[PDB]
């Protein structure tokens, strides 16, 4: 079968990007089921999953050939509500960047609705499926609990100076450091919870730069990653050419000029 290559580039940042896309992300910490459910804020830990419609087996389905060959996720079969996890990630070398969180979701999980924005990245899915996807992300090297956190609202912070203790600014201060560990004591929409969810130690600055997918001047400078720039240019050029005419001849139409690439 076809072997994916995912993304160009040769720096360790490009290597990290391919790790996130391929799902080959190291597990770094453990978050209990009850702690994660409390943080997400959609139901009480241990409570039954609420439903938005009856289980498929109980209500039946239309005679659709696609339904009959596409297996529903566990949460879809059960009729769970569609709920969400949402993360914000610092531009000061957080492990994750928004688009690559969405690629991780889209490549590696079934029945997911990821969304990418500058200051927030969301995964919507049937509740129990969403929980499993969030657990994978939050336990992995995609997360530093100082540089990233669950924020379902009031997300400001990705682009701000870090606090003196290295925590990304949160207007609602849903997390804080206690004894070297990041503690979350509000749910993702700012409601106090009756527990202290221990997300463990923040990454060192050096570890963050080894694990990050972002290019910036204090790490891997974007200007030096000529393979990614070539890729961007190739895609823009071919889009421009084929919007004019969808044929090979458009690639040398008048107006293209002496286009040139670094590595190809």
């Amino acid at each position: 079968a076809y072997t994916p290559q995912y993304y160009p580039g040769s720096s360790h940042v490009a290597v990290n990007r391919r790790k996130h896309m391929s799902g080959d992300v190291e597990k770094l910490r453990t978050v209990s089921d009850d702690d994660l459910v409390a943080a997400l804020g959609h139901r009480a830990p241990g409570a039954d999953y609420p439903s938005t419609h009856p289980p498929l087996a109980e209500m039946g389905e239309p005679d659709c050939p696609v339904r009959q060959m596409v297996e529903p996720t566990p949460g879809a079969a059960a009729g769970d509500r569609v709920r969400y996890s949402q993360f914000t990630d610092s531009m000061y070398s957080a492990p994750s960047i928004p688009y690559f969180r969405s690629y991780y979701a889209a490549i590696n999980f079934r029945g997911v609705d990821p969304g990418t924005l500058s200051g927030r990245q969301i995964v919507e899915a049937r509740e129990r499926d969403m929980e499993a996807q969030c657990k994978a992300a939050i336990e992995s090297e995609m997360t530093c609990p100082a540089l990233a956190g669950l924020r379902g609202c009031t997300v400001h912070g990705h682009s701000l100076r870090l606090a003196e203790d290295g925590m990304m600014f949160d207007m609602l201060q849903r997390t804080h450091i206690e004894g070297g560990n990041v503690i979350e004591d509000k749910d993702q929409v700012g409601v106090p919870i009756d527990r202290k969810v221990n997300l463990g130690k923040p990454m060192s600055d050096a570890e963050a730069k080894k694990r990050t997918t972002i290019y910036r001047t204090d790490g891997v400078k974007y200007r030096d990653e000529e393979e990614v720039l070539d890729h961007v240019h190739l895609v823009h050029h071919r889009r421009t050419m084929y919007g004019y005419r969808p044929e090979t001849a458009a690639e040398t139409a008048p107006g293209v000029g002496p286009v040139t690439y670094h590595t190809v």
Partner: protein
Amino acid sequence: AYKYPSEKLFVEALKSKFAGLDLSDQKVKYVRAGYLQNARKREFQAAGERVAEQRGMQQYDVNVHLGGMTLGQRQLVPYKLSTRPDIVEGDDLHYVNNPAMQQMWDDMKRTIIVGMDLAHETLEKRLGKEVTPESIAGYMEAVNHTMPGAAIVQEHMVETHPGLVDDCYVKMFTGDDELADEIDSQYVININDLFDKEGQNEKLKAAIGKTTWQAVHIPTIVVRCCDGGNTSRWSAMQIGMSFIAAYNMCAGEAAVADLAFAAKHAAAVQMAEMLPARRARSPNEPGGLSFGYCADMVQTLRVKPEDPVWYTLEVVACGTMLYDQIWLGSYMSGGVGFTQYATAAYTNDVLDDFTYYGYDYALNKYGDDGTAPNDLATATDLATEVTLNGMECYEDYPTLLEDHFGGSQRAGILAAASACTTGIATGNSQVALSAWYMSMYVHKEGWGRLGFFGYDLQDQCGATNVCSYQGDEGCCLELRGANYPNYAMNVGHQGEYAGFTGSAHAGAHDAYCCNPLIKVCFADPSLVFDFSYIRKEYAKGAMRTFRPAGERSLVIPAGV
């Protein structure tokens, strides 16, 4: 030629916001002061207390913000108007709070340009009247009495209060210097005096020819009570009354209807046409405003064409405010709206730094204004260099990144600097448009983010639709506008497109971009807003020093 200096242009504003700050520091102490840190928020809270007490119903209250926190858990930072000394609180740039911004749009909306040649031909053909400088002069006196809402034919007419309509007037303009010199100068836009640099006056007169036009500006209060669709109709009614009186016509004969059709339709040049049903709007509203017309309304180009960047960035300031803050942020949505989506393009000298850097790069690599190759390779080079340099600025100066805290702001500013550099360098708006989309693609891969959820709808459609020639895709940038299908929804683009449309013609050393009638009309100093220096006007509005038209103080009570 221009030489980019050793200190970034945005450093002054950073130092003025953060006295004593080490601009390399990536960390800061958060004090979580809340709203009490800020004089404007405190003034708003007190205003909300009075509102609630006077009407018996809760209104503004900072404590209603969710999460038990008020605005200002971080520092609330003010904004320097770019190229100005004025630093203002952010709320002072909200369109609702800023009369300069309101009056800029009202001045556009209340304007219509109406040809006189067809009307004169009608008088000659149907009535056998001779049109002379003397008859035109009598007409210009008549139309400046009637246009604000006063009577010239009937008995027992009631009229508008002249003080409520003091901003309404009509001037004529023409490429015929002999006619222009015969009419009293109070009634004429003097093309030669206003367009005295780089032979711009001769370019405009050659383009307009020996044709005669009226620049009509109906009262601000009228468009405020009503809409932009009032403008061409109001204009035509009083043009018609004035022709009736000035040419001794029957006050309502068949020939009058030819004058009406001419003034309403055949010789009328709207600022904007109507919009489709989902966003139904009358003519002369922002969604119908083309980028070429927007660029031509701004007048910095007649003051200092030797600095193409300045005019370019005044167009950006004009367009980003109008299109993002008033049009998208109000007409098409509302609420708190979209102030900072637009301020990023006209404050803190940020876009200026990134654009002058690019201008210097292009001058050194490709040569003089407007001489760079008009091709995709050149757009690629300029966009990539300008975008990489800007991203490096945001990375090296933490408080710069914190200013443009939303990715959408960063995307529009990096892409505007890229496309304005390309426009000035190549003199070609369409090539600049390729550079705009290239900036976005470069940006996305560097940081793994771009703008808001729906920022790059036009972005991802963008490269392939620059050079399409299909019916609803192909269009030169000058004729695109806020109703071009891909552009019809989203912040952070429309005013920047007007800006680099201006940049291409500034780089070519043209006198205008799209319509010489628009260019002359908006050069007139008798307008309320000063179209020659947009950001200076915005500062006045933010400082409560801009006097708008349309207020009703003459006809309302006051008292304790």
